[PDB]
C-alpha cells in the first residue's frame, strides 16, 4: 500500500502532535530539541487478520484507515536547535499540500 504523510500519530502526546500543522509538517521557525518529532508518517500496517474491534469498530466508524503502522521521522538524539527551512518535492502526477 502507499505510505502517507499525516498530522496524526497514535500513542504519542499532543505536545508532540502540536508543533505540526494540519498537513503534518512542523511550523517554520519552531524551536525543537532532541527526541522530538519532525513529520508524522504512517505506513500500511497490513490487515492480515480480523479482530472483533476490526469486525465492528471499523464498520461502525466506517473509517478504513484503520490500524496503521507508524514510521514518523523523529529528531536524532544529541542535536537540537531551530528549524530554518522546509523543502518538499512530490513526484509528478501526485497531489500536493498547502505548504507546497
Amino acid at each position: 500500500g502507499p505510505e502517507e504523510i499525516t498530522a496524526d500519530i497514535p500513542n504519542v502526546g499532543e505536545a508532540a502532535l502540536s508543533k505540526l500543522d494540519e498537513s503534518g509538517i512542523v511550523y517554520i521557525g519552531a524551536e525543537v530539541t532532541g527526541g522530538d518529532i519532525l513529520v508524522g508518517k504512517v505506513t500500511p500496517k497490513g490487515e492480515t487478520q480480523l479482530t472483533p474491534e476490526e469486525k465492528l469498530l471499523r464498520a461502525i466508524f466506517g473509517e478504513k484507515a484503520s490500524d496503521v503502522k507508524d514510521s514518523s521521522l523523529r529528531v536524532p538524539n544529541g542535536v537540537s536547535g531551530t528549524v530554518i527551512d522546509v523543502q518538499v518535492f512530490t513526484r509528478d502526477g501526485v497531489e500536493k499540500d498547502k505548504r507546497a
Binding site: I5, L38, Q87
Partner: protein
Amino acid sequence: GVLKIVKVYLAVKRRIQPGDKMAGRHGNKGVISKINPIEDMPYDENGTPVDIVLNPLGVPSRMNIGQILETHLGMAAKGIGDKINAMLKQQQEVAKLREFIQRAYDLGADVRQKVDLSTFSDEEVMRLAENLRKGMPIATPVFDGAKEAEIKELLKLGDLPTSGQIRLYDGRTGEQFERPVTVGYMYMLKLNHLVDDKMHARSTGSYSLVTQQPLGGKAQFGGQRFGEMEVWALEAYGAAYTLQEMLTVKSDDVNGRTKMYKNIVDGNHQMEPGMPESFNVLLKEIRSLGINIELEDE
C-alpha cells in the same frame, strides 16, 4: 517508487566550550583547557587584560620563531590604530590625521609601494580613517619579510617599548613578574573538530542482528570498540576477571547481561559466566563447511 520527499534544514548557533580544538597560522595546534573570569588573567599597567595565554615552551622545540615576529608586528600594528582611535575620538582636523597616516605609509626602506593621501579626497580620507580604527592592516610578500630593524622603526612610530615586552600584573597576585613578557595580537583560526560532536557515550541500547554486540558511531548510539592491543595490555596485568567480564557479559552473553541488569538494580554485583554465542556462530560456520567440530564434555 517514492511519493514525496520532505527536506528539513535545521540550524545550531554553537559557541566555544572548553576542550575544543584551536589553532593559529604556524602549526601551533592546541586545545582550550579552561575558561576563567576576566579579572584572573594578567593585565597591563594601562588596565587592558590579555585574552590568550600560550605556552612559550612550544617555540624552541618546534623552531616556530616566526610566530614571535608576527606577535611583535601584531602588537606594533594595533598600536597604530589606537592612537588613530585617540585622534579621531577627540574630533581633530583631518590634516592632522593625513600627515600621521602619511608618516605610516612612507615609513621603512625604499619599498616599491608609494602613496599620497593628499591626492585622494577629504571625505574619503576620513572614511578610510574611520575604517582604519581597528589597527592599520599590514602585509608582507612571502619571501620578502620586513627586517627586524624595520619592525623597531615602525614601533618607534607607535609609543611602545623597543624590545617588545611589557611588565604585567596578575589579578590573583597583583605584583610584577620578575621577567617582562612579550605580548601582541595573534590571528587565530577555528577548526571543525568540535569537542561536542566528538563526545559520545552509551549505557545500553540496540545490538547487532547477525551477532549480538553493540554498534559503533555517534549516530544510532554506537559503543566504543575494544581492540586487541589493549586486550594484551590487560593480559599484562593480572586482570583475569575484568577481561572475562568485559568479553562475555557486556559483549556477547545475551542471557548473562539481562541477569546482571536485574542484579545491578538489585544491588548485587555477581557476574554469571556463560557461553559466547559468537563463538557458537563461528562454530556453526565451521560446521557449514562439512567438517565436524564439537565440544568434548562439560
